[PDB]
Design a protein around this nucleic acid. Structure first.
Length: 105
DNA sequence: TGGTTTTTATATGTTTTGTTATGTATTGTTTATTTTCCCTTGACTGACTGACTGACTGACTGACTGACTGACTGACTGACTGTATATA
């Protein structure tokens, strides 16, 4: 919230929050779905959305792509099988042409 | 140009088959001890059969025996030949 007021400084580059309550989500691949349906409002399945999103991330340069900040909540039950989801996530977090602000709990 | 059909991706459901860990019961492993009848050890027992004692009848040398055969010698009978006798 203090960082929101810092966005209300209008001297830092505007960026956007993402609430992630996987516990207020059913199927833990819906992260990608809701991500696309809130960054675009466009509706797909995870196996299109995350892939279009990698396409959105590394294949896309900086000058128009936006900083986004995201924070994950209670990962102890989210990734219970093999953490391929969160593996994908942390695999997205390793670029130099893409910019993001990631956190978890 | 413009409407319609065909296939595909995502999502879920259905069914069969095969994988892993485990707790309980049976049975094996090692060691010590006693009994059983089969297999060695051996004298007794019963028929056996080798050397010694009897024996029994066919083979070669003792020639034998005795008839018969082989040379010699005289006896005898036939063939040869003289003495003799008779007639022209």
């Amino acid at each position: 919230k203090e960082l929101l007021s810092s966005s209300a400084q209008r001297e830092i580059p505007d960026f956007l929050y993402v609430e992630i309550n996987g516990l207020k989500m059913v199927k833990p691949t819906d992260c990608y779905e809701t991500l696309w349906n809130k960054v675009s409002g466009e509706r797909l399945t995870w196996a299109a959305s995350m892939e279009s999103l990698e396409f959105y991330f590394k294949r896309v340069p900086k000058n128009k792509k936006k900083t986004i900040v995201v924070l994950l909540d209670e990962l102890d039950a989210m990734v219970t099988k093999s953490q391929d989801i969160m593996y994908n996530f942390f695999n997205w977090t390793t670029y130099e042409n893409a910019k993001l602000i990631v956190i978890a709990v």
